[PDB]
Amino acid sequence: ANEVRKVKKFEQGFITDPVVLSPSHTVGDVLEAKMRHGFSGIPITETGTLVGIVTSRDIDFLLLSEVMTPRIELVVAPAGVTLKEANEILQRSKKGKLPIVNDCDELVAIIARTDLKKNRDYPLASKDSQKQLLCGAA
Amino acid sequence: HETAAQRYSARLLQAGYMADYLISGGTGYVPEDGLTAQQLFASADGLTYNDFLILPGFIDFIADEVDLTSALTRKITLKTPLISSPMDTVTEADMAIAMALMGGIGFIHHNCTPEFQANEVRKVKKFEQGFITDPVVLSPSHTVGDVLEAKMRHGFSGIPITETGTLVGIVTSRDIDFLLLSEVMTPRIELVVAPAGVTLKEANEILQRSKKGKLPIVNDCDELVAIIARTDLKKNRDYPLASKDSQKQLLCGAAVGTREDDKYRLDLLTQAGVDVIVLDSSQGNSVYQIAMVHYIKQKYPHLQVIGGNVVTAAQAKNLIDAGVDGLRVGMGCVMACGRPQGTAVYKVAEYARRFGVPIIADGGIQTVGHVVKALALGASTVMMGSLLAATTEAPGSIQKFVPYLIAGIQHGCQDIGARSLSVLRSMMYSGELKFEKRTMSAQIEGGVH
Ligand SMILES: Nc1ncnc2c1ncn2[C@@H]1O[C@H](COP(=O)(O)OP(=O)(O)OP(=O)(O)O)[C@@H](O)[C@H]1O
Ligand SMILES: Nc1ncnc2c1ncn2[C@@H]1O[C@H](COP(=O)(O)OP(=O)(O)OP(=O)(O)O)[C@@H](O)[C@H]1O
Ligand SMILES: Nc1ncnc2c1ncn2[C@@H]1O[C@H](COP(=O)(O)OP(=O)(O)OP(=O)(O)O)[C@@H](O)[C@H]1O
Ligand SMILES: Nc1ncnc2c1ncn2[C@@H]1O[C@H](COP(=O)(O)OP(=O)(O)OP(=O)(O)O)[C@@H](O)[C@H]1O
């Protein structure tokens, strides 16, 4: 059921199933996640999908808990956007993450700049009537 | 300097229990067992490092108090008794920096155009630890494609920019990832540049606030002088074994040939500021090497000169009294001349020592045991050969690898019971250190084969 959920929710540019950490978290248990999942730019709010980001450059000189980015991030997707619009925002912003936030002013999805370097046109879409990927189960 | 009998009797009296100090001094008797070095080489069998052992002594210090300070030449001194050999397969500007940061020295090889060797010396003298040596600066007139490919040429991609060469801005992959333009990238606005030359620990604090990947170093003229990269600040180590000159920058040497065409090579290297010259030659005692020696000492009276290879006291005499300040003691390690290396090192070291001209035991060293030996026989420094080839510095990393040899030498000179290589040699020449020969049956059983 988890795998199928993961597959139905793909969204092309956005990160499927992003990791949010809790502002009540000393950085060592974030810094090791780079040793667990490999990625290391983590968005930060109470438990799930507010303050900004904790990112490798914030930690690479160091213990502390939340002496990193408050709610003060650069330009972001204000509700939900086309991938082509976020591609232009990343160009001006130069930063590596781009949050998407809802009208309640909380994170709802996130983008990574490295994936925007490599996303493609897929005319052979294989999408359902709800415009998201088809998948099967044995 | 105190003998095993002096140290045992004194250190026993530090713990506590007469006419035993008054009837034989601090020499409270020890058995004679094994050969002094002068006896070992008396038989006129030509020994090499596999043929003898050093009978263990009395230990009264930890394996981390074995001072390794050695002397390279009459005036250059090193924190480590190692050297990288002047070979194309071993030493270039990268390994020369790596050796000096490990307290040794490196000699840049000479199998090249004279200009290339002078450039590789210049690259070593100007190291500065945290800063990027020889940064790449691009012109505001270039189209971005000829910057974006440099990432395909040199691999890095945060290029500082100004009129032709060492600031008006920067360009980085983040300025270029989405696209060809000619100039649209970050103009002068930079988040806390260094206004002049600064301490590396100050730049370490500036990068923490600034969060950017590059930190320009500028001058009161409002132009670049150097640049720092964040990735190097994450990793730069302590190097207390400094190997620095009086001007507080790295020592390095250069090999030169002895040909008539080499006064020009020697000029370019002395203009690049090289600290020491090794006269590369298969046999050093030649009229045109003694001419080359007299020529250097007549023209550049500051430059230290290490005499090309010898294996006899007669060769060592002719080069010393020509004025050289060192000696590569090694030859023939199929050619009809040469000497067994262990006998060469002992005989040349024992001769040179009369004048104070330390030697350099180059040739056929392939274990840390052989290093400890070559240092017990009289060599002041050991020149690591192809042992360093197939490391990542060779044209598994020299910075990580040299500490192994250091700890090995220290453990050795601890079992021998000598607290510092200078004491090891003093203990050898005074006949306090005892040696043993080894039949083939005694080394076919105990290692080696
Ligand atoms: N916050 C995140 N939550 C979950 N996965 C993420 C997250 N950030 C990065 N990833 C994973 O890594 C990929 C993007 O890598 P990215 O360039 O963002 O790494 P990074 O955070 O910059 O890593 P690093 O700091 O080590 O360079 C995504 O496709 C996804 O697989
Ligand atoms: N959208 C954003 N707006 C503002 N600041 C951000 C944003 N995303 C990340 N940051 C912060 O900016 C700095 C740089 O992070 P960024 O994602 O741009 O690169 P990075 O993950 O450090 O990349 P890299 O590790 O490869 O050098 C960090 O302090 C980070 O917390
Ligand atoms: N401007 C430069 N000129 C010359 N060498 C440089 C320069 N910038 C970086 N380097 C080289 O690149 C190495 C790594 O630097 P850095 O991590 O900052 O690369 P970068 O500019 O961020 O490259 P990239 O954007 O591809 O990751 C440095 O140790 C140095 O050897
Ligand atoms: N010292 C600086 N002061 C201000 N801006 C700078 C400075 N150095 C670089 N920049 C700019 O800041 C942005 C990010 O540069 P940065 O050095 O962090 O990227 P980078 O590390 O080279 O790229 P990457 O994250 O892929 O490794 C770019 O627009 C760059 O031109």
Swiss-Prot record, chain B:
Effect on the protein upon substituting residue 204 to K: In LCA11; does not alter the enzymatic affinity of the corresponding enzyme; alters the affinity and/or the specificity of single-stranded nucleic acid
Boundaries of every CBS domain copy: 131-179, 185-243
Positions annotated to bind IMP: 362-364, 385-386
Keywords in alphabetical order: CBS domain, Cytoplasm, Disease variant, DNA-binding, GMP biosynthesis, Leber congenital amaurosis, Metal-binding, Methylation, NAD, Nucleus, Oxidoreductase, Phosphoprotein, Potassium, Purine biosynthesis, Repeat, Retinitis pigmentosa, RNA-binding
Family annotation (PROSITE patterns): CBS, IMP_DH_GMP_RED
One GO molecular-function entry: IMP dehydrogenase activity
Cofactor: K(+)
Protein name: Inosine-5'-monophosphate dehydrogenase 1
Origin superkingdom: Eukaryota
Lineage start: Eukaryota, Metazoa, Chordata, Craniata, Vertebrata
Activity modulation comment: Mycophenolic acid (MPA) is a non-competitive inhibitor that prevents formation of the closed enzyme conformation by binding to the same site as the amobile flap. In contrast, mizoribine monophosphate (MZP) is a competitive inhibitor that induces the closed conformation. MPA is a potent inhibitor of mammalian IMPDHs but a poor inhibitor of the bacterial enzymes. MZP is a more potent inhibitor of bacterial IMPDH. Subject to product inhibition by XMP and NADH. Also inhibited by ADP.
GO biological process, one term: GTP biosynthetic process
Disease linked to the protein: Retinitis pigmentosa 10: A retinal dystrophy belonging to the group of pigmentary retinopathies. Retinitis pigmentosa is characterized by retinal pigment deposits visible on fundus examination and primary loss of rod photoreceptor cells followed by secondary loss of cone photoreceptors. Patients typically have night vision blindness and loss of midperipheral visual field. As their condition progresses, they lose their far peripheral visual field and eventually central vision as well. Leber congenital amaurosis 11: A severe dystrophy of the retina, typically becoming evident in the first years of life. Visual function is usually poor and often accompanied by nystagmus, sluggish or near-absent pupillary responses, photophobia, high hyperopia and keratoconus.
Note: Because IMPDH activity is tightly linked with cell proliferation, it has been recognized as a target for cancer and viral chemotherapy and as a target for immunosuppressive drugs. The activities of the antitumor drug tiazofurin, the antiviral drug ribavirin, and the immunosuppressive drugs mizoribine and mycophenolic acid (MPA) are attributed to the inhibition of IMPDH. In addition, bacterial and parasitic IMPDH's differ significantly from mammalian enzymes, which makes it a suitable target for anti-infective drugs.
Modified residues (Omega-N-methylarginine): 339, 353
